[PDB]
Structure formats: C-alpha cells, structure tokens
Design a protein around this ligand. Structure first.
Ligand SMILES: [Mg+2]
Ligand SMILES: [Mg+2]
Ligand SMILES: [Mg+2]
Ligand SMILES: [Mg+2]
Lengths: 6, 236, 236, 6
C-alpha cells in the first residue's frame, strides 16, 4: 500500500 | 546531544547536503539537532525532518520484513532447525527500528506538538505521531500492542478533525494524512471497509475542489490523489 | 570487539541474513567478527567479506563524490560564499570512508594475507588491499598521496604476478583483479594507455581460453569480460 | 568505470 512521504 | 555545538542554520544546511548525498542517517541526526534547538520548524524544515526519518525507518522496516518472512518460514512443519540466529537478528533490527520510532515520538512530544498552533504544523506533527506509532504497531506482538494501535489511531483522528475544519480538501498535508490513515485502517486495524471508505471519500472531495487550484497546486494534489486511487485499485 | 561473544558460524549465518535484508553495515560488522576469530576464510566467506565492505564503502564514495562536486562548485568565481559547512560535511564523510578502508586494510594485515598460501585466497586478499588503497587514493590530497598510490599499485602488482603464474586467464578472480587494476591505471595513476593495454590483453587472453570451460564457468568469465569491453568502449 | 564486486 502507498503511504507518504516516500 | 552531539549536535549541541552546531548552529541551527548549519544543521539545516547539512541536512540538505545529506539528502543530496543519500545519507539520511546523517540527515536525521542533523534534523534532530535542529529540533533540539527549541525553536519551531518552518514548513521546509518540517519536510526535511519527515523525509530523513522516513528513509531511516524505511530501510529498517524493509529489513524487518525480509527477516520476519525468513523466521516465519523457519517456523513451519518440515523446516530444518537452524538455531536462534534468525530470531536474534530479527530482534536486533526490531529493537533498532523501535528506537528510531521512539526518538521521533520523543521529538514530537518534546515539544513540537505542544508548540504547534497553526493547522498546517499541528496536522503535520500529529500525522507523524500516527505514522510512527503505526510502525511500532507493525512489529508489536505483546501486552501493549492494543495500546500502540490506539495511540496511532488517536493521533490520526485528532489530525483528521483539525484538517477537516481548517484545510481545503485538496491540501496536500490533509491528503497525505488521509492516505496514511486509510492504510492504518487496512493494514493495522483490520478495518478494510473503513480504509476503502476513507480513501474514496477523500478522493471525491478533493476532485470537487481541484477547480480552485493553480496549475502547480493541481499537480501537487493530483499526485496524492493518484496514490489513493492506486490503493483503492489494490483493495477492490 | 562487540562480536567476540558470538560463534563464528552464527556470525557467518547473520552476515548472509544481513545481505538478504540489504543491511551491509551489519553484514560487514558480522564478517569483521568472523575474521577476528583468527581462522582462515573459505571462498564463500571471502566473498561475503568483500561484498559487505564494498557496499559500505560504495555508499560512502557516492556521498563523497556528491559533496566534493558541491564543494568544488562553491569554490568557483561568482559563486556565493556559504561558510564552512560543505567543507566540514565533506570532511566528515571522508573521515568515515577512511576509517572503513583502514578497518579492511587492518583485517588484511592482521592477518589474512600472511595466512593465505593458496593462490585463490592470496590473490583475492591482495586485490582487496589494492582496492582499499585505491579508495584512500580517491580522496587523498596530502603528503602521503603518492605513497597511498604506490601501496595500491604494489598490492595489485603482487596479485597480478601470482595470478599469471597460478591461475588460468579465465579465472574470475584473475579477471576481476585485472579489471580493477586497469581502472587504477586509468583513474588514479593517470596511465590511460596502461589501462587500455591491460584491459585488451586480459580480454584477448581470456577469449582464447573460453573453450576449456563448462557452461557455468563460461557464463562467470564472460560476464567479467563484458565489463572489460565496456570500459574499453568508455576509454577509446 | 566498472569495477568488481558491485
Ligand atoms: Mg545560534
Ligand atoms: Mg506556536
Ligand atoms: Mg566457537
Ligand atoms: Mg594458510
């Protein structure tokens, strides 16, 4: 799953 | 602290050099030094502190996941016994990662959050508090696991309540907070329908407010919206 | 040393876990612990020690090159004065990299090289000695710079003399030594024609001996030969 | 320039 910051 | 004799401005300058040199352990130690000067952080400084610690903990979380996977395989039926080393080395990486999360949480508590009155700073720090409890929850397995999950939850929910009152739905901090909290619901809290609801609602509310943006703000907000849509694609 | 209470076999096992987890600082500290047990290293163990330290020093050399480039730009005409920080941080990374090269050289001297009697081990360690003096020479600018270059040179030349007497021209250690020494001539010793001669001669002598190899040995040797050819393309 | 190991 994408989360921020990278 | 070892950065106590360095000027605040020179710590900031060296954090930006360390970022260019791909040396985020160094970057995070310069930014820790800068926070410990006791002054509030500007927006750019707040971004340098979060990028530095995210890259330090990101390498730790990647290693922990590789070691956990080897340890879980070692623990199946018909798997050959290899001794305590995978367990010990997994624990060494876990303890290191716990220590970096404790350090970031300690900076937020002493005393970045209490001194943050504007919504952009307070939401940013409470999102970070939720993120670093979330990385603690990712390795927790003991009597405090529930409490670590609740501390993440609480922090994200206070940040959401301020963001929804004080920021437009396209604000990139509000969007990255919602992205992060949706992943907390999916991966940590075992609440996939709350995750998908929050990502959908956040995406649709931001879409409806794009028309108010400049070209550069449009590009910042749509980049994050695409991450929400990519998670929704991976979850539905 | 902090690894003195760990079994030799458990240090080797943890170096291989640390490699899988992309944690070569850890990998290099486990392999340093293993060398300090005092026993000779097997071929696979020799490979783990060289991969660990190469990845640690590789990140240091990449950062040093980014910081050197910023520092050299800062030192041109019409460039704004920014204080001592780029110089200081370049120096901090340089000193760190020097310390890792000194640590590897110290392991070779105490006492890996003196205890290596077979050609594969002795050539491997003398190549490493040349490589780590070469990384010292890459940052040297003082009264010992000539001497650091000569120490690299000497080590590579003793390794070449043993390799040419004791190993076939397709042996991968002999090929990687020749690749490395050719780059020493081009980049350090200001001898591009010696570099190109050594890479051409090494490539042609290996080509002529491919017919003796199994499929798997062929693939190992041709991979390295292609690096020689890629350097020759970049140099001619 | 290429050198080994990587
Ligand atoms: Mg001051
Ligand atoms: Mg304030
Ligand atoms: Mg023993
Ligand atoms: Mg011997």
């Amino acid at each position: 799953s994408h989360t921020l910051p990278c | 602290g070892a950065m106590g004799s360095m000027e605040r401005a020179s710590l900031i300058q060296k954090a930006k050099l360390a970022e260019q040199a791909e040396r985020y352990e160094d970057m995070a130690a310069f930014m820790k030094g800068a926070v410990e000067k006791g002054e509030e952080l500007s927006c750019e400084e707040r971004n340098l502190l979060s990028v530095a610690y995210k890259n330090v903990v990101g390498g730790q979380r990647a290693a922990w996941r590789v070691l956990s996977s080897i340890e879980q395989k070692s623990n199946e039926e018909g798997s050959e016994e290899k001794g305590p080393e995978v367990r010990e080395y997994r624990e060494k990486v876990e303890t290191e990662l716990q220590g970096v999360c404790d350090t970031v949480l300690g900076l937020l508590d002493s005393h970045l959050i209490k001194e943050a009155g504007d919504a952009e700073s307070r939401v940013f720090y409470l999102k970070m508090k939720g993120d670093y409890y979330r990385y603690l929850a990712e390795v927790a397995t003991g009597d405090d696991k529930k409490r670590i999950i609740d501390s993440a939850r609480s922090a994200y929910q206070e940040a959401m309540d301020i963001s929804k009152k004080e920021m437009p739905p396209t604000n990139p901090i509000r969007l990255g907070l919602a992205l992060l909290f949706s992943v907390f619901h999916y991966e940590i809290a075992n609440s996939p329908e709350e995750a998908i609801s929050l990502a959908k609602t956040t995406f649709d509310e931001a879409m409806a407010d794009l028309h108010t943006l400049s070209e550069d703000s449009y590009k910042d907000s749509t980049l994050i919206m695409q991450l929400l849509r990519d998670n929704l694609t991976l979850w539905t």
